[PDB]
Design a protein around this ligand. Structure first.
Ligand code: HEC
Ligand code: HEC
Ligand SMILES: O=C1O[C@H]([C@@H](O)CO)C(O)=C1O
Ligand SMILES: O=C1O[C@H]([C@@H](O)CO)C(O)=C1O
Lengths: 126, 126
C-alpha cells in the first residue's frame, strides 16, 4: 500500500509510536501507582492487540530505511521469529487482561516488554 | 497518557497517518483498478474502524499544537459533532464491507472521505 519506500518507513514509525503509547501508558497501572480498572485495561489491550500486528507488513521488500537494520531482510526467518514471539506474548497479555488479574497482567506485561527490547537489540540501529 | 502536549500531538499525527493509509489504500479497489476481495476489505475496514476512534482522545485540554486549529477547543461541541459524523460514516463503511458489495462500499467510502475533508476544512490549519 506504499507508493515509495519512505511511505512504508513513515507507516511503521507511526504504528510503533502508537503501539509504544498503548503499551507504555499501562506502566503506572502495572506498578500500582495508578488504579487498576479491569475493563479499562481490557479495552486498551484490545487496541494494543490490533496495533501490534501492523508494523510487520511495512517491512516489505525494498523498504530499507529508518532505524531498521538491513539484517531484517537478509535474515528474514529470524526476524519473523522475533515478531511472532512478540505477538505470542501479546496474546498472553490479552489473556491476562481478559482475566482481570493484576498479578498476571504485570507478569505478561514484563514478557511483552522483554520481547520489544530483544528485537530492538538485534534489528534496530542504535 | 501524555507526559507533555507534544506527546499528544505526536500521537494524533501518527494515528491519522495510519488511518489515512488504511483508508487511502482502498482507493484502487473502489475505483476498480485493483481487484475486489471482500474478505480482504472486511479485514482492512476492521483495522480502520479501530484506528478511526483513536485521534480524538489526543485533543484533550492543553494539547494545542500541530496543525490543529484552536477552535477545536473553544468550539468543542461542534468539533465533537464532526468527529461523531465521521465515526458514523465509518460504521456505514463497516456495514458495506461486511455485506461484501462493491457498490455499497464505493458509496460508503465517498461518504467517509467527505467527512474527513469537512473536518479539515473547519479545524485543520492550512
Ligand atoms: C521486531 C520484531 C520488533 C519488535 C517486537 C518491536 N519492535 Fe520496536 N522497532 C523495531 C524496529 C526494526 C524499529 C525501527 C523502525 C524504523 O524503520 O525506523 C523499531 C522502532 C521502534 C520505535 C521508534 C519509532 C519511531 O517513531 O521512529 C519505538 C518507540 C518502538 N520501536 C517501540 C516498540 C515497543 C513499545 C515494542 C513492544 C510493545 C516494540 N517496539 C517491539 C522492531 C521491533
Ligand atoms: C475532525 C473531526 C477530523 C476528521 C473527521 C478527520 N480529520 Fe484528519 N486531521 C484533523 C486535524 C485537526 C488534523 C491536524 C492534527 C494535528 O495536530 O496536526 C488532521 C490531520 C490529518 C492528517 C495529517 C497528519 C500528520 O501526520 O501531521 C492526515 C493525513 C489526515 N488528517 C487524514 C485524515 C483522513 C484520511 C480522515 C478520514 C478517513 C481524516 N483525517 C478525518 C481532523 C480530522
Ligand atoms: O514502551 C516501550 O517499551 C519498550 C522497551 O522499553 C521495553 O524494554 C520500548 O521500546 C518502548 O517504547
Ligand atoms: O486519504 C485521505 O482522504 C482524505 C481526503 O483527501 C478526502 O477528501 C484525507 O485527508 C486523506 O489523507
Amino acid at each position: 500500500q506504499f507508493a515509495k519506500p519512505e511511505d512504508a518507513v513513515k507507516y511503521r514509525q507511526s504504528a510503533l509510536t502508537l503501539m509504544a503509547s498503548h503499551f507504555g501508558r499501562m506502566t503506572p497501572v502495572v506498578k500500582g501507582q495508578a488504579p487498576y480498572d479491569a475493563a479499562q485495561i481490557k479495552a486498551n489491550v484490545e487496541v494494543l492487540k490490533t496495533l501490534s500486528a501492523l508494523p510487520w507488513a511495512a517491512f516489505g521488500p525494498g523498504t530499507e530505511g529508518g532505524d531498521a537494520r538491513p539484517e531484517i531482510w537478509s535474515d528474514a526467518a529470524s526476524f519473523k521469529q522475533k515478531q511472532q514471539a512478540f505477538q505470542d506474548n501479546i496474546v498472553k497479555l490479552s489473556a491476562a487482561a481478559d482475566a482481570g488479574d493484576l498479578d498476571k497482567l504485570r507478569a505478561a506485561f514484563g514478557d511483552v516488554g522483554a520481547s520489544c527490547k530483544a528485537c530492538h537489540d538485534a534489528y534496530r540501529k542504535k
